[PDB]
Paper text:
The basic local alignment search tool (BLASTP) sequence-similarity searches for proteins showing homology to eukaryotic peptidoglycan recognition proteins (PGRPs) and thermostable Ph2119 and Ts2631 endolysins allowed to identify in the genome of Clostridium intestinale URNW (accession no APJA01000012.1) an open reading frame (ORF, coordinates 584335-584853 nt) encoding a 172 aa protein (Mr = 20,090; pI = 9.96) with a putative lytic function. The Ph2119 endolysin, in turn, was used as a model in molecular replacement to determine the structure of LysC. The overall RMSD is 0.81 Å, comparing 85 aligned Cα atoms. Unlike Ph2119 endolysin, LysC has a large part of the N-terminus not present in the electron density maps (23 amino acids in LysC not visible). Most probably these residues could not be traced due to high mobility-intrinsic disorder. The catalytic site of LysC is composed of His50, His147, and Cys155, a motif also present in Ts2631 and Ph2119 endolysins. Other conserved residues, such as His51, Thr52 (HHT motif), Tyr76 (IGYH motif), and Thr153 (T(X)CPG motif) are close to each other in the potential peptidoglycan binding site and may therefore contribute to the catalytic function. The phosphate group was modeled in two adjacent positions in Ph2119 endolysin as well as in the LysC structure, with occupancies of 0.8 and 0.2. Crystallographic and site-directed mutagenesis studies reveal that the highly positively charged N-terminal region of the protein is the major contributor to the antimicrobial activity of LysC.
The two endolysins under study in our laboratory, Ts2631 and Ph2119, which originate from T. scotoductus bacteriophages, reveal structural features characteristic for type 2 amidases (family: PF01510), with a Zn2+ ion coordinated by two histidines and a cysteine residue. Both these proteins show amino acid sequence and structure similarity to numerous enzymes from mesophilic bacteria, including the LysC lytic enzyme of C. intestinale URNW. In the present work, we determined the crystal structures of Ph2119 endolysin and LysC, both to 1.2 Å resolution. The overall structures of Ph2119 endolysin and LysC show conserved catalytic domain architecture, including the Zn2+ coordination site.
Author numbering: 24 to 172
The structure:
Amino acid sequence: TPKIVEVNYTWATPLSYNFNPNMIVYHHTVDNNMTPQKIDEIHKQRGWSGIGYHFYIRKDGTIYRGRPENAVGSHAPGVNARAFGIASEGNFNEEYVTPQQMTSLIALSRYLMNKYNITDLKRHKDVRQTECPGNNFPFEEIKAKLNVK
Ligand SMILES: [Zn+2]
């Protein structure tokens, strides 16, 4: 089972648990050097309860929990009730996922896919107009390693 680091959050507004995931959406953070706590602060400024992603993967491969696994997130308006959101630290218009981020992306994705019977993997740019998760985000390689077509 991948190592998920639990984080102490204080949620500003009520979380909804009317969450029925059938999709994983991949994100980049654009900004580097952010703790999950810093993301949570920014997401609170934007009027969300707190960190909008269900998971945040830092450059050294550490997987932090964001939103509770059974709560609706704030990462992709229009699919939030049906999508896990997985963020990777970086701006992948300008750099590449680290090998440790790739290892964690595959492990976390397969965990969620098996646990929830999910086969639908999407980039944020596949569901909304955005450059996220960045030009160099290795989407086709992730799908290939997970045997998704
Ligand atoms: Zn995004």
